[PDB]
């Protein structure tokens, strides 16, 4: 049983919720600069 | 001038075959004139051939066709010939021709220079000169409309009575 899933209705939230969170995160990331930097971390937000 | 009370659409301003100003609903206001005239000639020619073929079918059949198709005409003939593959062959080859007809319509609408219904099919140079060509255009359009109404009449007569054209008009 993959991910403890025995009913196919359980897959709907497990896949769906990360999609919506990724949509919000993708709006955030599209707001960003997204070019390469030479440093230990990116100070641009 | 067809209907004295009303007026023709501004697309109907002469310079077209059969233009008697008859378009009360206003199809030419929203549809291009070339597409309309091409469709009119296509429907007219299809109905001309259909009516003549139906008359011939109710008069005399081909040798050996009654053994397979039986005593079936019009709609039963179609229902048997779709299973036989005759209508399938007709569909394939006529759609193959309509591919070239389609690109002809496209080139007409984008401005190649051809007129609606002009496929260049003039064997024996019949009616290719002077005012005879325009008279043949008018005759073709009027006879196409007449054959359209007649084809509808034949189909609905077989729907109502179950008899062919030449036997319905003699057995009222």
């Amino acid at each position: 049983e993959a991910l403890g899933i025995d009913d196919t209705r359980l897959i709907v939230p497990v896949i769906l919720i990360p999609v919506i969170t990724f949509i919000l995160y993708a709006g955030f990331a599209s707001e960003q600069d997204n070019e390469d930097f030479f440093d230990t971390y990116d100070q641009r937000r | 001038q067809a209907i004295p009370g009303s007026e023709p659409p501004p697309a109907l301003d002469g310079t077209w075959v059969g233009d008697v100003g008859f378009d009360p609903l206003g199809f030419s206001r929203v549809i291009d004139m070339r597409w309309l005239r091409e469709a009119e000639l296509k429907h007219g020619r299809v109905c001309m051939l259909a009516a003549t073929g139906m008359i011939v079918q109710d008069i005399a059949l081909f040798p050996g066709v009654t053994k397979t198709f039986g005593p079936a005409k019009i709609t039963a003939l179609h229902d048997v010939a779709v299973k036989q593959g005759s209508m399938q062959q007709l569909l394939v080859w006529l759609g193959f021709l309509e591919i070239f007809g389609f690109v002809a319509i496209v080139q007409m609408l984008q401005g190649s220079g051809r007129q609606p219904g002009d496929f260049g099919f003039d064997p024996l140079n019949c009616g290719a000169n002077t005012d005879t060509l325009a008279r043949r255009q008018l005759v073709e359009l009027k006879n196409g409309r007449l054959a359209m109404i007649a084809t509808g009449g034949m189909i609905h007569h077989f729907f109502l009575t179950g008899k062919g054209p030449i036997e319905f008009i003699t057995t009222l």
């Binding site: 009913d7 939230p13 919720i17 990116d42 937000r45 | -």
Partner: protein
């Protein structure tokens, strides 16, 4: 028992998704020495 299971799966997925996409959101920049 299935309704409770799907509610729990939805809640766990929601909070784990928030965690995962929050630490992906340039967490190293969120320090007082930035800029």
């Amino acid at each position: 028992m299935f309704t409770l299971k799907i509610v729990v799966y939805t809640t766990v997925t929601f909070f784990v998704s928030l965690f995962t996409f929050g630490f992906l959101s340039n967490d190293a920049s969120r320090n007082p020495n930035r800029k």
